[PDB]
Subunit: 275 residues, 3 copies
């Protein structure tokens, strides 16, 4: 029962999502340990005659929270016996070692970009929106896009790239100004004010494009190694009983990964409101 | 306590039983997967004048049930510490890897030949005797042997080789015809009608020789590999407690084996009856 | 939390204690198996005229009890994750493989020398003091040292070397005769009668120097090997639960060691008494 050999092919959507997630982060200068901290604040005070003005700047803030990749899989447990007997299932498991690692990289970037997704807690757009008021409620408009861009530009510096989902892109392309084309209307990516927007995969976000300022990304690197003892959910196919076993049966190779993201001071956000 | 080094020698009876079990099966053309099926049936219908006779033959039957070899042993668990310390016990365990594999091959052939032995269920003589009436009850006789051979020859084809146990061979050699020698009486194996009988090890069978028609045998091949985590019965010698351990202590190397036997249409059988 | 990298240096006291423990034993001719036994007893009987004197000597006594080194450590379990990430903790664990093995060698010699320390039970000074009266109660004195030496010399042979602790050495150096210097008074080790005393680490002994006769030492040799499944005490740092796990998490490499000590007939002992 349930013993058949079949060839499996990798999906094209997973490869496109992995490239989109890497471009959305835009990290610079990767470090092994979380030691880097911003100290600049700039203090200045003016007088008129015979006055002693005091100026001092001191700050320390470092974020370090590693996210581990998935080890043993419940679906791979049934395929473990198929991998030993058939060459087709063994080749599929080898391709899965690179497929799941890209998916783990995509989920790490999603946790910082979206407030609902939690993995590191207190990084990128998720920490910026809760601490400082930047997100605007309502429908997307050409006049509203110019107003939202001005508020983001006022906080220290101006935004370079904006992350947008495919579902949000459809609503953005539909909206157009009376005289100006604004939303694409040719071949290139649509721009709200001037700068081009980059595509990013999102599950929590549905409507509205969010822009990110400056954020550094650092990762150790995803590796693949076979493991004999690993904690997994109980599963039975034929003539087997499982209740508290982890060392007796191996399902999938344990992947080790460590990635850390630097927290941003201010980030632009947009969300649709319904009443 | 219980710590002594001694040299062990392999028994001659196990080697003879392994060769007898391989000859008794008489398998032809081994396959990796159970895909082969018999389709021939032969249909024929005769008439006289202006008649439309319909003839069609279609059949599909494939048997596939793999039998796994024994892994960790309870007797080898006490010998595991002796193998690490002494070279004599380690050499005995290496010889046991080939000895138990031959015993596993002998048990697989016994399951098809004898109805009581179950491993695959629904193969060779065990499936033929239950589905079709072929076995005869009573004492072995020269006139009875000729009558039993005629019934086996009527079903499709004639029998080539008959499997016989050592206990059944003693009763067979004692019986002899009034004019003809019949049972050996020289040097070669005893024949009931004409064709020679092959020796086979049997635990369930006691009296009466059983003949097998055509049956194909296919096996992947017995291998030996060391294992750290394997489910075994609890055992304690000195200063140890066991209740639910499989990964902590290793007893014997886990042997992997897969063998499948093709089901036969008709097979001759003989058994003694008592009242 | 609790994640910092720091360089660790080996202590000088552990190296000095290891050399002192090896010198205190003074074992000769090492054997793999406990088969050696003393048979000599010497029997003699004298007469005068027409007398038949019978003389016979037969004896058999062999001691064999192996002591195993420590495997997984509770302190190393927290350092296991630090060893994989940082090179400083991994180098400290490699040095610990040789440090703990020397400590295990020191504890084995302490079990025979001191009655309180049990590992083998029935070896060296621990078996000699309980079976035969040799230990003297009271304060250490120059006249008492000469009296204690005479009792030890009477039993078969004379003592060659005496084991002394650092705490007992301070009291021994303070005591001195009216005319003779006795206790060191130059540079070399202090002698009670003539022969020099060797330093040995002791936890049970506090006052009084004990002398050992003849005792053979035999050991297989300490080795280091990595283990996946080993029984250890439950420990948790962050987001982990432990109750009955040994195979899932590895703390330290399992060291295998076997050492045996030959029992002595008579050994000198000294202890202080308080009323």
């Amino acid at each position: 029962k349930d013993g058949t050999l079949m060839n499996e092919f990798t999906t094209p959507i997973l490869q496109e999502v992995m490239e989109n997630s890497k471009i959305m982060q835009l990290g610079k200068y990767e470090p092994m340990e979380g030691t880097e901290k911003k100290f600049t604040f700039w203090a200045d005070k003016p007088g008129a005659y015979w006055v002693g003005e005091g100026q001092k700047i001191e700050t320390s803030k470092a974020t370090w929270v590693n996210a581990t990749m998935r080890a043993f899989k419940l679906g791979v447990i049934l395929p473990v016996t198929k991998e030993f007997l058939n060459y087709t299932y063994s080749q599929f498991f080898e391709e899965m070692k690179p497929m799941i690692a890209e998916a783990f990289y995509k989920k790490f970037d999603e946790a910082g970009i979206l407030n609902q997704g939690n993995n590191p807690f207190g990084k990128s757009i998720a920490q910026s929106i809760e601490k400082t008021n930047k997100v605007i409620k309502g429908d997307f408009t050409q006049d509203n896009i110019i107003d939202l861009e001005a508020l983001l530009e006022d906080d220290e510096l101006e935004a370079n790239a904006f992350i947008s989902k495919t579902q949000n892109r459809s609503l953005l392309r539909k909206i157009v100004d009376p005289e100006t084309k604004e939303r694409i209307y040719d071949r290139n990516s649509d721009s709200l004010d001037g700068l081009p927007v980059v595509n990013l995969k999102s599950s929590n976000l549905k409507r509205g494009e969010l822009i990110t300022g400056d954020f550094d990304k650092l990762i150790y690197g995803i590796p693949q190694l076979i493991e004999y003892k690993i904690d997994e959910t109980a599963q039975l196919s034929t003539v087997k009983n499982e209740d508290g076993t982890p060392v007796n049966l191996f399902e999938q190779d344990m992947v080790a990964l460590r990635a850390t993201m630097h927290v941003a001071l201010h980030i632009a956000d947009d969300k649709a409101f319904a009443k």
